[PDB]
Design a protein around this nucleic acid. Sequence first.
RNA 1: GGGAUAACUGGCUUGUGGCGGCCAAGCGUUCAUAGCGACGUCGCUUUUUGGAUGUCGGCUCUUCCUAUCAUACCGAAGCAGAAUUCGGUAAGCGUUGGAUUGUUCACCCACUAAUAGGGAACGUGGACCGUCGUGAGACAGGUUAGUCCCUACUGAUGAACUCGUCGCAAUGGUAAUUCAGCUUAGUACGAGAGGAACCGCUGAUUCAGAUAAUUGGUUUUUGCGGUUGUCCGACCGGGCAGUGCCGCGAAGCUACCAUCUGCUGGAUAAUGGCUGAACGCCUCUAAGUCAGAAUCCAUGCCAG
RNA 2: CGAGAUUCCCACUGUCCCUAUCUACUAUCUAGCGAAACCACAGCCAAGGGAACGGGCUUGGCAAAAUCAGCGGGGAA
Lengths: 560, 341, 476, 62, 135, 54
Amino acid sequence: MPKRAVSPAPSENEVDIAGSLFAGGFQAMGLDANLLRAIARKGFSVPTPIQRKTIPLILERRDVVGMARTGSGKTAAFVIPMIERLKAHSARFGARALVLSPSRELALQTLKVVKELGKGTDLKTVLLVGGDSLEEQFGLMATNPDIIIATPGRFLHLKVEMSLDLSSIKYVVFDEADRLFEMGFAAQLTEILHALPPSRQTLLFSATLPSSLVEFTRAGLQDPVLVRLDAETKVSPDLESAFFSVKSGEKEGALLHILYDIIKMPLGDPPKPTEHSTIIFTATKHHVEYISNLLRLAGFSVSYVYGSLDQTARKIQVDNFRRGRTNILVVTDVAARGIDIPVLANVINYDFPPQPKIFVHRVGRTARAGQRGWAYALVRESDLPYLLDLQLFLGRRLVLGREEKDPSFARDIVVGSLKRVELENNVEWVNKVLHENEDIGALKRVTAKAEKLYMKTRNPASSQSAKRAREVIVSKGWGQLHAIFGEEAANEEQVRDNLLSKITGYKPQETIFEINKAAEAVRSFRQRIGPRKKAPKEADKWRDDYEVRKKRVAEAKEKR
Amino acid sequence: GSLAFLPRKRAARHRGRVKSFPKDDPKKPVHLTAAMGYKAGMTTIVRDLDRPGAKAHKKEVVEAVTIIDCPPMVVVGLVGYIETPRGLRSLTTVWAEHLSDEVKRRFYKNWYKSKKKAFTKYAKKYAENNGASITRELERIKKYCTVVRVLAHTQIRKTPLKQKKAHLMEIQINGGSVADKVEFGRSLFEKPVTIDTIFEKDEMIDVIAVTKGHGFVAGQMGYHHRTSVNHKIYRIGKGDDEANASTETDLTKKKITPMGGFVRYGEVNNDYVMIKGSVPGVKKRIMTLRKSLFTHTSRKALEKVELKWIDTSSEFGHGAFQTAAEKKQFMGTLKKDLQTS
Amino acid sequence: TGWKDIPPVPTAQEFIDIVLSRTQRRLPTQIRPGFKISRIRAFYTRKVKFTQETCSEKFGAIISSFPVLSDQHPFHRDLMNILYDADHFKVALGQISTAKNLIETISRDYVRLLKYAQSLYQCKQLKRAALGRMATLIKRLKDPLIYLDQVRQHLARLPDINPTTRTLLVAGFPNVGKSSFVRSVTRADTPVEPYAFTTKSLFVGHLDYKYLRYQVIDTPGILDHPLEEMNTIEMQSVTALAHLRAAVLYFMDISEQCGFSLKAQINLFKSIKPLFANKMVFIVLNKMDIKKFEELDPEMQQEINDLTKSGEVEILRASCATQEGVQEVKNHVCERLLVERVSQKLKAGTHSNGNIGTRLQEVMARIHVATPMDGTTRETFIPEAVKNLKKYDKNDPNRRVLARDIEEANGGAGVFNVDLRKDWILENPEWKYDKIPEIFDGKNVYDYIDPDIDAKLQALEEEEERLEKEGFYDED
Amino acid sequence: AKSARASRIKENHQRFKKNIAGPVEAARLERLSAKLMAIAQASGVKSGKSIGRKDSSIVFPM
Amino acid sequence: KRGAPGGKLKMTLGLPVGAIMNCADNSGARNLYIIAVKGAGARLNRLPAGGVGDMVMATVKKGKPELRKKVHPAVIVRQAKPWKRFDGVFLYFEDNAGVIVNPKGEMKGSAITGPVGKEAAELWPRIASNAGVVM
Amino acid sequence: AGTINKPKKPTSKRKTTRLRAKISKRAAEKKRKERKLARKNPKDPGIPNLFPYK
RNA sequence: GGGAUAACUGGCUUGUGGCGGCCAAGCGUUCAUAGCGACGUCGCUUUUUGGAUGUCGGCUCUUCCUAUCAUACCGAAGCAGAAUUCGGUAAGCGUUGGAUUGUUCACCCACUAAUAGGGAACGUGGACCGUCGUGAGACAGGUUAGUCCCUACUGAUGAACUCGUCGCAAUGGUAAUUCAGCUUAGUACGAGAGGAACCGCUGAUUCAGAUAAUUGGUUUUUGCGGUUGUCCGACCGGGCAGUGCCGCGAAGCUACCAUCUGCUGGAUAAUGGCUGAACGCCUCUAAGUCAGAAUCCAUGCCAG
RNA sequence: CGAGAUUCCCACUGUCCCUAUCUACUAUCUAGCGAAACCACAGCCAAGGGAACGGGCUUGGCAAAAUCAGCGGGGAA
Ligand SMILES: Nc1nc2c(ncn2[C@@H]2O[C@H](COP(=O)(O)OP(=O)(O)OP(=O)(O)O)[C@@H](O)[C@H]2O)c(=O)[nH]1
């Protein structure tokens, strides 16, 4: 029953940098002495670029939209100026600062950051999350906090129950707004926006900017300034790229070949990332589970983190990866933007991204701080138009097969085919596993259905991309070996495949039926296609511990 | 509910009408088709299953079985029916002399205030050499009739009930020529017929009764004439044996009646029929046993039954003592019994 | 696994007849002028939508069910290309998509027209016109349906090989004896009729070789054409020889009875040599019984040995008529193939690094043989009876009785009742078929079974006699 | 599943009736009739051999 | 073949759809959530109920993070609802327990904790094989 | 077909006066329309061969 | 503001488009050319590479139709087997959900033999009188328009036919459904993979009629045991808590919370035949006739 | 009595149902007394009955006193 009961939990990660149509120390920023001491105790010595760019604007009281990945310090970025503006508890009744976060874990993280950075101040901070006692929340509101950290649904429920007045709120923060919209909090978010007074400073911190989020910001923010994490879209020059044209029936074997030979990954548990750091990005959570199980069967140290995974499980997996207990990390898109990913050395995309900008994000996930990175793509015939959209977006010359003897794998988009021998052996072993163990077969069937649904639900390409995709398929470079396999290989396969190219380029004279009405129809069809030029229970006397249980009952009665 | 059994009607007669008898062919030997008893109650048996292909084959199986107290029935009449373009119709009936007091109570309604005159002139006609008329009636039955039924009555004076009015019923004689079956009935006059005679061991039959009326909390719900088909007699007990409930497996000399007697029925001293499964009707009620109209089509029939024992613990409570002997032995001596002794 | 589970596709008139039959039969059909105009338009638009839905589901099933040419193994893609022109197949399966898409476009068009319809006759003629458009579309689609039905039939009646598994191909000129060899080596029926192109399609059999499956393929044959011009049968032959990663056997005969000169086979084999350079190839001199390897001319011997000179070729003798050496040749070639496969399997996992793969660790764990350090062997209990009884053979007439035969004589599965009493072994035989008392006087006879109970009863009786002397029952 | 009144099931039931239950019920009724018999033996006009009269909506009143 | 046991006698089914039963094998799950009973009939307003020896769709609500919130087939091994046995014996269990099983019959775990019903053991051979206590 | 064992809905031959009147009016209209078309506007077979004295 | 229609359909509805040309038997102004004119074909839609939906509903129940989803039966198909597709005879049988949504279907996925379509009078539970504006409107202004009877049916009784017992059966209703396992059999078949069916046997689902031997549940049996607080100054026994509460509990009633039972002959429809005319061949049909569906009709069953 | 050892549960909800408790509403028979609304005359069904007009009428199905309790059929814009 619960197979795609509602929908694929990771739907898509849509981004719209067209939202850009909106428009060195803490002592140098001149914060209060107590706030500076709290920051020093916390250990923030050099501000990261996100807060270095946002905090002056927030102190200048301008609405802010911040494009920043998780872990860059967004919470600190929007709490430090908030505390600097507050500076004290207000004797007048009414909350002054409000923060809306998707989940209780993120709310708790924000609460801990607020407490640690406001150690010493008399500010009263409250947490309003689902599962807590409504009476306890009423008591906290009676104690009148100055800072509120809450989820939209619980905050709306409390506001409706208590007829709370939000006119005293001057500081509003939307943490993880793209996650809010993906979870569907938009209606009560708009209700809270309507309830809040117009004279407020709005900050919205997000990793992605979907179109719905852009519309919401345009409708609810007063002249928002868009701050972005520096060159998040600029592809690092130290990133090396190789793209492999692979068939669906050989595609898992191709992935195994890349893991075995192209990376030369060791097998088994490894004896702060590692030297290899192999991450794989896929489309669906079913693909994540299938690839993870297949790779653990193959002998890799694989941690898998997918969208709708349990919180504790995802923390354990991310901890294992970041401490180097596992070398491969399998993620689609959602868990990727969710979790903190350290510096990586190898990035492989199993399912090609629909959006070149998603590809840019996935390849900027590696090759950072001047370190060299490697990126391998698995591209199918159906995925080629998206590769062409990507090459238009990146402005890089296309090298098909071996048109150039020494193509620049960093500046030129190089696409080729993988080695036939090892490809076929990995395909054989994959087929053997699929035939042998039934669990993997069931996973194959469910991930195939999920891939079919993803094909229907994927955003389409452009007409011209489809066009020169046809001409690329016609071109010889589609079936030729990749430039990474060696000039001696080029020699042997060039000696051979030319007659094989003639075999593949056979135009049969007549079909075997021509060798009846069906035959006549085939012949006429041929002429037509001719090419165009709780108290304890009462003590029982028979019960062994009769007197003891009577004493317990009497003690409970005295306790009342 | 089922449309074949609605609207819910009361049973016009407390006895229960047989309606249909098995089809007759002359080739079989002569036999009666029906018998009557009284539902005494049910007990529990365990059986060594002899059903090949079954999961519980050759294993102990626990089943619930109805006891029907079946005193010998007395033949008191013959009837001759003739076939007509309007159905069967009673051509003529012959009675027997020395009719019992209880069958006379059946013929009467207020017996206590009526001077016993019924069938007196008929007995006189027998006695005063109107055997001419007797043989005339018998010859008419032999010559013109195709179906003969024996009038037989069951005897409350042996059953352990406060009732005193007998129970009458017509029972067809099949398997033979008309003259043969008329002679057989004429021999049958004034002789008790046992259930060992009518029915036999380990066989499948049909049972007619009136299912209980659930009265006093859209209309009549209960008290319906029902003939439940395909119920298997497993055992026939003898009364006089006193080893009736006794089975070859346990040589425990006891009768079919558990400790304290049957609840709301009493204790049976007669021939009894022990049949598998729940059976329509209640205690003290007349139960009509008859043969199946068709030859059987399952191994459940012609499956031979071997018994182990019969539950004789008191059904008035959750007792576990089969016999008074083992009970008085296990409980030991009590102060009241000691003071009496 | 194959391609037989491909649903049949109908002709144009068929598909029209069934589609219109569904839209006639599966929906309500009666409407009245007195009914509301809204209900009238709803009725007619429901008709149009159902016709759209059935046409779309059928065409979607057809396309998504036919094979996707350029995702299969190169053998499969080129084999289906030579059997069936890939470009033409693709333009067909194209026309059918464009036609379905135009069907949905017409569907929305007439949905808006019916939504803005104003009269019963309006809805009448609108529905008639729409259904006419779909009818005409299928009428033009008449020929692709026939072509796709034919390709479906063959792709169903297509042999299914496994390119990855251990395979042995048999190739050469026609009439050499390839079919005879394959019938000799495996249980596959191949026409052995003696004319030039007897087999027009690839034939497949299977064999076992020390508990291991091998698949043997018989190919039709190749003539002296330089692969630029070919018959389609020779093209599927060469495609198999080129894309099936397998052991290759080239059958040639010293006698020119096949109709080709020894020089002709030599030229053909050197022409196809680069296609076999990577592989292991085995030239088999067939019909040695009629023409042995010695008597042919010395320069013929010299040229065949010069062919032998290369290191990935081998020479074998065989005579398929009398089966002189078929067992030996198959054993030897499959043995070398097995050794090569073992080498490849070892390398996959022995790849340079220093850490062995988990599968390789498991295979060492399996192959490892345990033996006690003490080196002692336990004494065994094998009886002389089972030593000298006879082996169980089903065809043997003077047979044992068998419980199965007893069952079949006395009924069947649900009829025969087994009797354990015959199997009972007892001192006194008539002990069997006797009931065993179990419970007596409410105490368990089995629980109170005990030998020497006579002596124990004597002891109890002595004790009771002592008690009686003591007067242990008197009243005071 | 075939109906209880299917022709094939009826034919199989008739075969079972004639081949299996037949002899068993025959022997049963034989011993039953034997015990029945055990228990049972356990002027023309003036004598009554000639059948005479005892002691109309079919014909119109006359 | 659809996942319905063949050759099972009648019993008092005591596990309805949506039931939190405890886990038996060492797979790591702490409880299984009965959500759909395989082989149940199609009756309106009637909640499908399962007994010992029936494969039932289960979801791990509480368990190890690796196996949490996972749906796989599972067969009932222990039921606390009293049921009778053809020897006329009414019996019931302390808890409600089932072992995770693939649709062919291979159990994901390796050892079965606690006792095992005779019905489950007889209907499924490997449950008898890997069951250490069956009564 | 099983019409022999299970007859269907009968088709009544008892004509209604309303239907009869409608048929009469429409047929009269048909006659008038034929006359209108005729007014709007826009070979002997010979003696039979089988005649004995042709 | 005047005038006009009081209003709609009722042998109406369905599965196969329109425009133009070619062809076209016949008919026609006098003749296939004043011209009308079906089926087909050609050209356009239409081709060289695979979301629409406004108020509604939601549930249950009875009955009926078939334009049949499944069960049964056959005809055809490269239908090896298995799994299927199309066609028709068939209404006895049964015909479940989740997502999504204003809400439905489409599509999507989960069971399941299967989740087929409908009918039942679409079955039962505002507009002027105006006032203030005329390049457009407003009016807390008004006048105001605006529904408990009979009887069929069933059950239980019932007057007279003298009372009672045992019977007959005209008539009316009618009931069984599906799945699974063993054997056949790893057989027939098959290159492999896989993989049947008949006969026989054993279970299970639903429905129907029963029953309390055994197992849970229910305690105005107020049965047995325990126990709370109160007052009558105290014992006493009481009112006491519209039957005080807590344990066990018989009988009875029950339970998809337990057990039992559910049945056979004929005639048919699609179809397959026999004999054999029309028509010197031929033919299942014309005469005669055989087999054949869960179909129909009766027995079995209920009422009388 | 053993620090005795081991196993199960505890959350919230602007969600549904049941059971527990509170308030309020609820009661039958025979005697005696004893109205009112309403009433052109009465109510089986099927088809027909031009004018969506049927209880009259035509053709049929049929049709047996009288009570109590359930039940469903009719009464222009
Ligand atoms: N004497 C002899 N004749 C053989 C032998 N092998 C094949 N043949 C001949 O081959 C003829 C049949 O041809 P195939 O056996 O099918 O040879 P092929 O290479 O498969 O070629 P095709 O006939 O086209 O299939 C037979 O008539 C034999 O005479 C052999 O070993 N000895």
